[PDB]
Design a protein around this ligand. Structure first.
Ligand SMILES: *[C@@H]1O[C@H](CO)[C@@H](O)[C@H](O)[C@H]1NC(C)=O
Lengths: 175, 55
């Protein structure tokens, strides 16, 4: 991975998350489960769809008959006609092969960037109220119910609200 | 040399006559006169497909 998130510090993907491309696995006393981040998933789908549409829609053609008929005394123009067809075949094949090769690399890195951004967005929200434990995972120093959980998914986590609750727990785990 | 049991040759010709035009034929012999003529309007483009695929 270019950004080191997919197949990087997040070692593997989740098959339990089927409603989206990127999301979360939560765990609290109320239970545990998988959920997909609606905001980041939809913004990545739009880019990919635009990417596919751009490749296809920019190719606009018109009515044209390739077939040309020549006699046995018109070899040179027949060879000229063949030279035109073969040259177009080589040009289109090389561009099409390289376009897919380069864009496939771009698409995978695009997913890598989105996963990395989502982790950093959560990191900026929690700050020192949570401990990074690898695998793209956070451990809360304070209790976090279902309302607190989706509030991170909402994007509306209240750091000062649990700042003193987490700070007291922070200085006791580390002896 | 005999081609389909023929030693004589027959060269065929064609031309297009625009509206408001006259075509004149003159010969003392060795002429194959037309019998049927086609009135047509060419469509620009298109080609000819040579294959055994049914339609
Ligand atoms: C944020 O998530 C909590 C979890 O239930 C909810 O109380 C609150 O309404 C959510 N905010 C939204 C959906 O804007």
């Amino acid at each position: 991975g270019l950004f080191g998130a997919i197949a990087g510090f997040i070692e593997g993907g989740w098959t339990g998350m089927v409603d989206g491309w990127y999301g979360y696995h939560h765990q609290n006393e109320q239970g545990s489960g998988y959920a997909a981040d609606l905001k980041s998933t939809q913004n990545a789908i739009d880019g990919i769809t635009n990417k596919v549409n751009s490749v296809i829609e920019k190719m606009n053609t018109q009515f044209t008959a390739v077939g040309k008929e020549f006699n046995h005394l018109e070899k040179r123009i027949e060879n000229l006609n063949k030279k035109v067809d073969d040259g177009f075949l080589d040009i289109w094949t090389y561009n099409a092969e390289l376009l897919v090769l380069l864009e496939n690399e771009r698409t995978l890195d695009y997913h890598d960037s989105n996963v990395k951004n989502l982790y950093e967005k959560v990191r900026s929200q929690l700050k020192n109220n949570a401990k990074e434990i690898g695998n793209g995972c956070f451990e809360f120093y304070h209790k976090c119910d279902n309302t607190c959980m989706e509030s991170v998914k909402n994007g509306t986590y209240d750091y000062p609200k649990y700042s003193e609750e987490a700070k007291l727990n922070r200085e006791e785990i580390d002896s | 040399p005999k081609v389909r049991d023929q030693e004589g040759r027959m060269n065929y010709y064609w031309t297009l006559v625009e509206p408001g035009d006259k075509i004149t034929f003159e010969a003392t012999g060795n002429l194959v006169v037309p019998r049927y003529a086609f009135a047509m309007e060419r469509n620009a483009g298109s080609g000819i497909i040579i294959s055994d695929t049914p339609v």
